[PDB]
Amino acid sequence: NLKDKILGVAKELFIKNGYNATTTGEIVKLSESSKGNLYYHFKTKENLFLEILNIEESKWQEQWKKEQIKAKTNREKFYLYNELSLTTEYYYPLQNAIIEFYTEYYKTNSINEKMNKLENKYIDAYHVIFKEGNLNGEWSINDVNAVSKIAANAVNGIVTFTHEQNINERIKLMNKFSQIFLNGLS
Amino acid sequence: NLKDKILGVAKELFIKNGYNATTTGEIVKLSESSKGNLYYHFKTKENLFLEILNIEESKWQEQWKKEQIKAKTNREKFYLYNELSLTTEYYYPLQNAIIEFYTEYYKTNSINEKMNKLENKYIDAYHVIFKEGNLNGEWSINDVNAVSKIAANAVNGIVTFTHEQNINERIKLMNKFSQIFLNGLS
Ligand SMILES: NC(=[NH2+])c1cccc(/C=N/N/C(N)=[NH+]/N=C/c2cccc(C(N)=[NH2+])c2)c1
DSSP states (O other), X not given: OXXXXXXXXXXXXXXXXXXXXXXXXXXXXXXXXXXXXXXXXXXXHHHHXXXXXXXXXXXHHHHHHTTGGGOOSHHHHHHHHHHHHHHOSSSGGGHHHHHHHHHXXXXXXXXXXXXXXXXXXXHHHHHHXXXXXXXXXXXXXXXXXXXXXXXXXXXXXXXXXXXXXXXXXXXXXXXXXXXXXXXXXX | OHHHHHHHHHHHHHHHHOTTTOXXXXXXXXXXXXXXXXXXXXXXXXXXXXXXXXXXXXXXXXXXXXXXGGOSSHHHHHHHHHHHHHHHHHTOTTHHHXXXXXXXXXXXXXXXXXXXXXXXXXXXXXXXXXXXXXXXXXXXXSOHXXXXXXXXXXXXXXXXXXXXXXXXXXXXXXXXXXXXXXXXXX
């Protein structure tokens, strides 16, 4: 494809380097394409980026659907979602580029809106796990939305700020995390 | 002092203009020093930045030292330290250059040595809280170092990934987290 070759190179450059780092100049030439080749699909760089986040977000929740089966209780669903976050190849390898973007562009309308529900989809996975868990009586969270946001963020922290060490040590900490968290909810 | 001036001027430059944009040439002339002297003290902008970061760390510690007296029990120190990390970083100017620097050297293993002696200093704060918490029956943790890396990175994630919404709510969530986490330790 072409529009999909752009999305491909970009994603590659957004992960390696930052958001502000890589410029629409690179993306273009690195795809043997031309500048005037960006409009109805990718006019602005923030549009291009925000699109990739949307994709990877899909791929990741899609992958979680095909893998959340290995866990019967939601307590297990919680552990498994976190451990997996560390090994995936979707969304999470972009958290660094996302943090720049969230700051550098915090004075536009395509921040508190455009990518607004992009976060709700990210805390969504936990929204279910905690709700279904209240039905399946594994715990009792009277403020799911909070805990969800809290768990989502806490986890993303462990994933993002340890990306430089024995991947199996990360898994152990992440499981040690989930144990603590869950033992705190109940 | 010529060295301390270079750091201070550089700290100001990085803040006003970000990391990537600031040149060692600028630093040299504004601190009325020289390429020679700057090279001799830091060798590179990479390092210069790390030293500033180390100094910012010490200050954070001297600050935390005076502040923790407001917290008699370690359970309290945990709440306080987390809340301070969230509120203070919200209006910390060097933060932008840190983000920029971090997402520009977390792939180059060279800048991963000092880069971690540093993070370890941040984790110590939790380590002390947790250890001391043991010697007070505030809780029993036999894997302190672990629980420490966990709390540090989780808290860091809550602070960095929530960045969107009213500050009061953020503090609300950060306290919620500290409550749950400390409860899953008992
Ligand atoms: N109100 C305040 N007095 C206040 C508020 C927010 C932050 C600080 C001090 N921060 N000091 C920092 N953040 N030092 N960071 C240094 C550092 C060095 C190497 C690596 C990293 C890192 N984050 N990986 C950080 C002080």
